[PDB]
């Protein structure tokens, strides 16, 4: 009773056991969602319903335990925040989706309420510590790219304006609007059928179309290369910075041992 429970129950939630236990629950719930299937017995559907109910309450006590220990800090970790949303959506998607669709009927909901399934897959990222590590690593790369992504987006916009006006009048399915031209230039950037599918047909009508797309390919390839090179040397800087300090620290360790002893050589003259 009292905070003695809180001290003991933190020793549960923060335990390596509890983390691993929840991981297997997610895996098992992910597996049951693989045998869900329209062509099946009513008896299989009824059994899966109860099993899916068992999971939804079982993850509920997980969220309650995690909130009970982390409290005001729980609603600030993006990982814990995601898990909470998924449990809420998974409650609605099994005990209220029908009551919604039967009144707020929309054809999207029969396709959007599936999100309760996709969310329970993504929990396998949030629960596994090695997966949180790799995902946060990938996300932290994005801020360094924003300036070159903005540049690429601006170059695309300029070329989409030009391609619409140059080629859109006679090839509207490819360049007839700014949106058409944006999509087609993205295809060209990926080099997908860029010549046989796009630029060779154009040159039957616009012989100098190659003067547009070949410089385009050089630019966006050059910017993509420099984008990747930036990521490489950014990650390398994170390494080198560590090696640098260790060498400086040892120089300052060496500074300690030598200088703080060579000081004594002037007072040890009394010997």
């Amino acid at each position, epitope marked *: 009773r009292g905070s003695h429970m809180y001290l003991r129950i933190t020793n549960i939630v923060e335990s390596s056991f509890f983390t691993k236990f929840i991981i297997y629950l997610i895996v098992l719930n992910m597996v049951t969602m693989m045998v869900e299937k329209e062509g099946q017995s009513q008896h299989m559907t009824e059994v899966l319903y109860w099993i899916n109910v068992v999971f939804i309450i079982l993850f509920t006590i997980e969220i309650i335990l995690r909130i009970y220990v982390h409290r005001i800090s729980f609603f600030k970790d993006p990982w814990s925040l995601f898990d909470f949303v998924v449990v809420i959506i998974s409650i609605v998607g099994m005990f209220l989706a029908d009551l919604i669709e039967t009144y707020f009927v929309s054809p999207t909901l029969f396709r959007v309420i599936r999100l309760a399934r996709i969310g329970r897959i993504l929990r396998l990222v949030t629960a596994v510590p090695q997966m949180r590590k790799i995902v946060s690593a990938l996300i932290s790369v994005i801020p360094g790219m924003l300036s070159v992504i903005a540049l690429m987006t601006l170059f695309f916009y300029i070329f989409a304006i030009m391609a619409t006006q140059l080629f859109g*009048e*006679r*090839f*509207p*399915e*490819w360049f*007839g609007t700014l949106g058409e031209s944006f999509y087609t230039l993205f295809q060209v950037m990926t080099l997908e059928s860029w010549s046989m599918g796009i630029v060779r*047909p154009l040159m*039957e*009508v616009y012989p100098y179309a190659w003067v547009f797309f070949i410089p385009f390919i050089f630019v966006v390839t050059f910017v993509m290369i420099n984008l990747v090179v930036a990521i490489i040397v950014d990650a390398m800087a994170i390494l080198n910075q560590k090696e640098e300090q260790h060498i400086i620290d040892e120089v300052q360790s060496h500074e300690d041992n030598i200088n703080n002893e060579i000081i004594k050589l002037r007072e040890e003259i009394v010997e």
Partner: antibody
Amino acid sequence: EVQLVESGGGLVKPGGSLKLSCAASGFTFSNYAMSWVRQTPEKRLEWVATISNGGRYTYYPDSVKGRFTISRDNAKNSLYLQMSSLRSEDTAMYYCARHLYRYDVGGALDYWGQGTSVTVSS
Amino acid sequence: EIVLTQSPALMAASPGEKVTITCSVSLSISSSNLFWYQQKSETSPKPWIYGTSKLASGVPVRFSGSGSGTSYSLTISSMEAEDAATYYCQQWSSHSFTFGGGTKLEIKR
């Protein structure tokens, strides 16, 4: 061989409606824009509709805007012209024609069907 | 919306004669965008010259085309009896095809 055959036509009353159909063979129909061209009884040729190869863009002269509707089915390899509010002006041989270049909605009409006569008369 | 006008409307011509017919354009157009068709009695038009001067596949090399800007022409160096037909010039601009009035060749006996 490339081949185009129009069908429908015949006699309509003014204000009436009629649907022409064109069947295409011997080429990748979905690679080409298609057009309909009138030939009036005094043998003047007059373009009346164009459709892009994917069907998403359609073009008409002001003489028929909103009265006619060009459409295509790339699976059936067929082309249609829904005509409505027909007038005596619209009495003509109607030809189905393929564009010279692929995807190009302009340029020239390199193959023409045999035509179907449409008479609009009371 | 560009109008194409052709002259003459009828041309009484004799085998072996050099025949030349004109298509005049109410605006300057690219010579790559002007086309010629040949239509024979109770058949559909067939493409004849692509751009101002490139003959279509199978056109007898006695045919030729020349022009630029607002004025274009089709020529037969020496007429043959099979050339008796109506010839239509055509252009494309904006998003509209327009056709010339046609020139009917009349073989002279």
